[PDB]
């Protein structure tokens, strides 16, 4: 068995309700696809505010609900990972702005930087932040997550 080895940044503004979602679902295709040992996954934030904290307790059991677990805890987004990682990919358009931004300041950004919900077959751009919302929130957010990140390593698997 033998391929090449592929790397996804998952990034939301905090890197605890949305990006942690998005970054344990992926992983646990990659698992069920057999494909682990070629992926290299992680995630990440725009900001500094939550650095080290653990990903919400909303999201946390909306995750079990699923039958998925995490380890995370939360850290920020680094010059470094526009060379590391083939892809970035955000939750809004807010996201967006401010990676791009950062992305200048690298010569050689070798990143493909994108929103995660442009790979959504049912077209929702965007992936709302539940924060403040309730528990039925989560669950539509780990609903997106999961149609967009099977389509997304469906076409670069
Ligand atoms: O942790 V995030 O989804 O930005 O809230």
């Given at each position: 068995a033998e391929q090449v080895t592929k790397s996804v940044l998952?990034?939301?503004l905090g890197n605890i309700c949305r990006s942690p979602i998005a970054e344990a679902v992926f992983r646990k295709l990659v698992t069920?696809?057999?494909i682990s040992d070629n992926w290299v996954i992680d995630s990440g934030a725009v900001?500094?505010?939550?650095?080290?904290r653990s990903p919400d307790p909303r999201?946390?059991?909306?995750?079990?609900?699923?039958?998925i677990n995490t380890a995370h805890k939360a850290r920020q987004v680094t010059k470094e990972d526009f060379v590391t990682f083939d892809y970035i990919l955000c939750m809004d358009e807010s996201n967006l702005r401010d990676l791009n931004r950062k992305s200048n300041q690298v010569k050689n950004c070798r990143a493909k930087i994108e929103?995660?919900?442009?790979?959504?077959?049912?077209?929702?751009?965007?992936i709302e932040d539940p924060y403040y919302?309730?528990?039925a929130d989560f669950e539509t957010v780990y609903q997106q997550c999961v149609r967009?990140?099977?389509?997304?390593?469906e076409k670069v698997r």
């Open positions: 998952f990034v939301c069920d696809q057999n900001s500094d505010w939550n650095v080290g999201a946390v059991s909306c995750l079990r609900n699923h039958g929103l995660l919900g442009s790979y959504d077959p049912q077209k929702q751009l965007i919302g309730n528990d967009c990140c099977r389509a997304f390593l």
